[PDB]
Amino acid sequence: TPCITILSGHFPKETIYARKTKELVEEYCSIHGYNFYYEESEPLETEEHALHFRRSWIIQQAAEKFPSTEWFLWLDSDVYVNPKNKNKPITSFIDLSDPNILYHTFHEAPWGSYPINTGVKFVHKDALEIEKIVWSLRNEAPWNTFPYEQKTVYEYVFPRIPGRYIVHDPYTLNCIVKAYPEHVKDALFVHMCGTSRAERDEHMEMV
């Protein structure tokens, strides 16, 4: 059972729904003994592409706070822990036993517009330096175009690490609410992907 550090972050901080997912994630980490890293630093770069790339920088903050981590888990600020599954461990939903694997990722077919969705991303500690390269690419075309870091993992990173990544079904660990409404109830991680700040606020009030 590996050492897991869950990390997240959101600019601006005082956004309501981001505070609400954070607490559900913090509670989740305390139940299972996972480390929780939440970025508190305001970003030097506030442009959309830069905020989307920021996860590649926060993982390094997480790495320095929690050096013993085996797997870093990025969850978007609009991803929360399903309260019905909050007492279930991540290792009940995914097999993290193949030592050759650097990334566990998730697809969003047939409803999504990209082959992977990096709103929930598992990064092995040995891929830390790769993530540093992903961050260093934030201002270069084409990687500074939508969909940014997600495109950079799929189109830059994955071709350079053949056989060292896995794309899983998203049903329990990256369950997009609008696309898989029927799975939401048995998901661990539920993603309010591609909705507005007010829409996400309202949804989190309901949870």
In the annotated binding site, the residues are: 9, 11, 55, 76-78, 191, 193-194, 200
CB closer to Mn ion, 78 vs 108: 78
Q: Does 116 bind ligand UDP (CB under 6 A)?
A: no
Q: Alpha helix (H) ranges present in the chain?
A: 16-32, 48-53, 55-65, 128-136, 149-152, 158-160, 197-206
Residues 185-204 that bind Mn ion (CB under 5 A): 193
Kindly report the backbone phi and psi dihedral angles of residue 35, in degrees, each rounded to the nearest multiple of 5, phi listed first. Answer: -75, 145
Annotated binding site for UDP-alpha-D-glucose: 9, 11, 55, 76-77, 200
Residues binding ligand UDP: what is the number (CB under 6 A)? 12
**131 touches ligand UDP (CB under 6 A):** no
119 in contact with ligand UDP (CB under 6 A): yes
Q: What is the C-alpha separation between 24 and 19, in angstroms, rounded?
A: 9
Q: Does 11 bind ligand UDP (CB under 6 A)?
A: yes
Beta strands 103-106 and 120-124, pairing class: antiparallel
Which of residues 125 and 191 has its CB atom nearest to Mn ion in the complex? 191
Site string for ligand UDP, 182-201 (x = CB under 6 A): -----------xx-------
Which residue's structure tokens are 């799929």? Answer: 154
52 binds ligand UDP (CB under 6 A): yes
Among 5, 17, 78, 168, binds ligand UDP (CB under 6 A): 78
Comparison of 101 and 121: residue with beta carbon closer to ligand UDP: 121
- The 3-state secondary structure of 35-49, one letter per residue: EEEEECCCCCCCCHH
Bridge partners of 166? Answer: 104
What Å distances lie between residue 126 and 3, 69, 80, 122, 150, CA to CA? Answer: 13, 10, 26, 12, 19
By the criterion CB under 5 A, which residues form the site for Mn ion?
Answer: 76, 78, 119, 193
